[PDB]
């Protein structure tokens, strides 16, 4: 793994010598399987907007 | 005051205003052609390939 550029909120690196079926697994776990926190329920009173 | 009749008139001159000369110009004046679109100046690759 050759890290090219890493700063806050970005990263660009290599992976030499890995086939597409593991690289796509890493890509597709970054997009849809690594979990986060996010707003689900909202409890309004006087949204007069 | 008898007002007798007379003979037949030979010709009838018709007086009328003349044709509108010097109204139209001798060359024609068309709407100019809308220009073909230009490639704008100052176009450069703003997208660099990532990593």
Curated annotation (Swiss-Prot), chain A:
Domain of life: Eukaryota
Signal peptide from the UniProt entry: none
Regions annotated as coiled coil: none
Native species: Homo sapiens (Human)
Involvement in disease: Treacher Collins syndrome 3: A form of Treacher Collins syndrome, a disorder of craniofacial development. Treacher Collins syndrome is characterized by a combination of bilateral downward slanting of the palpebral fissures, colobomas of the lower eyelids with a paucity of eyelashes medial to the defect, hypoplasia of the facial bones, cleft palate, malformation of the external ears, atresia of the external auditory canals, and bilateral conductive hearing loss.
Taxonomic classification: Eukaryota, Metazoa, Chordata, Craniata, Vertebrata
Whole-protein coverage range: 51 to 99 of 346
Compartments where located: Nucleus; Nucleus, Nucleolus; Cytoplasm, Cytosol
Function as written in the Swiss-Prot or TrEMBL entry: DNA-dependent RNA polymerase catalyzes the transcription of DNA into RNA using the four ribonucleoside triphosphates as substrates. Common component of RNA polymerases I and III which synthesize ribosomal RNA precursors and short non-coding RNAs including 5S rRNA, snRNAs, tRNAs and miRNAs, respectively. POLR1C/RPAC1 is part of the polymerase core and may function as a clamp element that moves to open and close the cleft.
Quaternary state and interactors: Component of the RNA polymerase I and RNA polymerase III complexes consisting of at least 13 and 17 subunits, respectively. Pol I complex consists of a ten-subunit catalytic core composed of POLR1A/RPA1, POLR1B/RPA2, POLR1C/RPAC1, POLR1D/RPAC2, POLR1H/RPA12, POLR2E/RPABC1, POLR2F/RPABC2, POLR2H/RPABC3, POLR2K/RPABC4 and POLR2L/RPABC5; a mobile stalk subunit POLR1F/RPA43 protruding from the core and additional subunits homologous to general transcription factors POLR1E/RPA49 and POLR1G/RPA34.
Protein name from the UniProt record: DNA-directed RNA polymerases I and III subunit RPAC1
Similarity annotation: Belongs to the archaeal Rpo3/eukaryotic RPB3 RNA polymerase subunit family.
Curated annotation (Swiss-Prot), chain B:
Record's compositionally biased regions (Pro residues): 29-41
Coiled coil (UniProt feature): none
Localization per Swiss-Prot or TrEMBL: Nucleus, Nucleolus; Chromosome
Phosphoserine, modified sites: 26, 34
Domain of life, source organism: Eukaryota
Functional description taken from the UniProt entry: Component of RNA polymerase I (Pol I), a DNA-dependent RNA polymerase which synthesizes ribosomal RNA precursors using the four ribonucleoside triphosphates as substrates. Involved in UBTF-activated transcription, presumably at a step following PIC formation.
Protein name (Swiss-Prot/TrEMBL): DNA-directed RNA polymerase I subunit RPA34
Encoding gene (name): POLR1G
């Amino acid at each position: 793994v050759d890290v090219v550029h890493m700063d806050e909120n970005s990263l660009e690196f290599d992976m030499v010598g890995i086939d597409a079926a593991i690289a796509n697994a890493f890509r597709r776990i970054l997009l849809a399987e690594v979990p986060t926190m996010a707003v689900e329920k909202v409890l309004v009173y006087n949204n007069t907007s | 005051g008898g007002l007798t009749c007379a003979s037949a008139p030979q010709g009838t001159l018709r007086i009328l205003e003349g044709p509108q000369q010097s109204l139209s110009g001798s060359p024609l004046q068309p709407i100019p052609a809308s220009p073909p679109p230009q490639i704008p100046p100052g176009l450069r690759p703003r997208f660099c390939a990532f990593g």
